[PDB]
Amino acid sequence: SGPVPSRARVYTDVNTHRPREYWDYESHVVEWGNQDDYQLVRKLGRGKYSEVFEAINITNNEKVVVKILKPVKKKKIKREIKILENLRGGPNIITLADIVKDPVSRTPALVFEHVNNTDFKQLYQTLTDYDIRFYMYEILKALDYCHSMGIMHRDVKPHNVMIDHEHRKLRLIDWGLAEFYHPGQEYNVRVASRYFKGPELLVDYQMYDYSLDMWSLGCMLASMIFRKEPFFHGHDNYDQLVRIAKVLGTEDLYDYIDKYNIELDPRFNDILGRHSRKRWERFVHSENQHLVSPEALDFLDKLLRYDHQSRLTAREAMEHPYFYTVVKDQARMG
Ligand SMILES: CC(C)=CCOc1cccc2c1-c1c(c3c(n1C(C)C)CCCC3=O)C2=O
Ligand code: NA
């Protein structure tokens, strides 16, 4: 009949136990400031519905980042603001500093702490084995925190991880697709970016949870240790699942589809084929072997699972042997 329901393994009911105001972002009241407190310096980039600038706060002469919002869906503005406010001060989460509107155009804009960034298309080429572990651990702190706060990021990818490599500091940005987890809710599956979409999104299983972010993180890890960007390189959403099935195999895929009684789109009927689950040594060569270890492969394998329930949680991930050296060095504070 219908799809089998599902619930997050961790942090299942945390929003239910909050006051309504925590997650009911539609009724949040915004105190809009004056963008004239800020002078734009230069354009830094763009989002799917935003343009991002370096700016100067002319009151205290501090450098900030201004994100001007022009979304197709409007209530998305209060959602992002409310999620950013709930998460403010959490480890490795971008800090929302102010919320303003241009006095003329009335266009809303978010003001953030400034962070430097090197584009991952030139930074990841220089990361050592240790650096990958260190920064993966920093991302996991951010994800464990926001999951523990009842929030799925739903857009984890290199472009959304700002790294100041000189100061070894990392921030997870762009919370515009983030959402509150509520058990039993059916979410939009047209989230995240193609190369980082979890199988639940590709097969249209809507009752997903925080474990979506852990798939995306596994895609990032695979591209870093194997030096293959992206790791799953699909032409479209349907071929994206084919690329995954050629690596993880079709047996576990059809068991997953069976377990949740998922109705598979007929387009997949003639393109998934039959594929074995490949051993990870198949992707190791002389150019990436210094980043690959038994610990790295054991950790990666535990993130990239079809069944979202069987993926590591962020906190389970942080206890994996792959991070023992980072944990020990963090304790002695170095
Ligand atoms: C120094 C350089 C070149 C980049 C640092 O870019 C920062 C720094 C602090 C804070 C943020 C960004 C940023 C944000 C956002 C984006 N970017 C960048 C990637 C343009 C892209 C769109 C979505 C979004 O939200 C954001 O909140
Ligand atoms: Na983005």
Residue numbers in the entry: 2 to 335
Quoted from the paper:
Protein kinase CK2 (former name: casein kinase 2), a serine/threonine kinase of the CMGC subgroup of eukaryotic protein kinases (EPKs), is involved in cellular key processes like cell cycle progression, evasion of apoptosis and DNA damage repair.
In fact, the CK2α1−335/4p complex could be crystallized under conditions with strongly differing salt concentrations while the CK2α′Cys336Ser/4p complex crystallized only under low-salt conditions. Compared to the extensive hydrophobic embedding polar interactions contribute only marginally to the affinity of 4p to CK2, but they are critical for its orientation within the ATP site. As illustrated in Figure 3b,d there is only one hydrogen bond of 4p to the protein, namely from the D-ring oxo group to the side chain of Lys68 which normally serves to coordinate the α- and the β-phospho group of the cosubstrates ATP and GTP. Thus, unexpectedly—because it is contrary to a rule postulated for high-affinity CK2 inhibitors and inferred from several typical cases of complex structures—4p does not require a hydrogen (or halogen) bond to the interdomain hinge region to reach its IC50-value of 25 nM. The lack of any conformational ambiguity in the hinge/helix αD region of the CK2α′Cys336Ser/4p complex is also perceptible from the final atomic B-factors which reflect the mobilities of the atoms in the crystalline state: they are low in the whole hinge/helix αD area of the CK2α′Cys336Ser/4p complex while in both CK2α1−335/4p complex structures high mobility sections exist, namely either at the helix αD (low-salt structure) or at the hinge (high-salt structure).
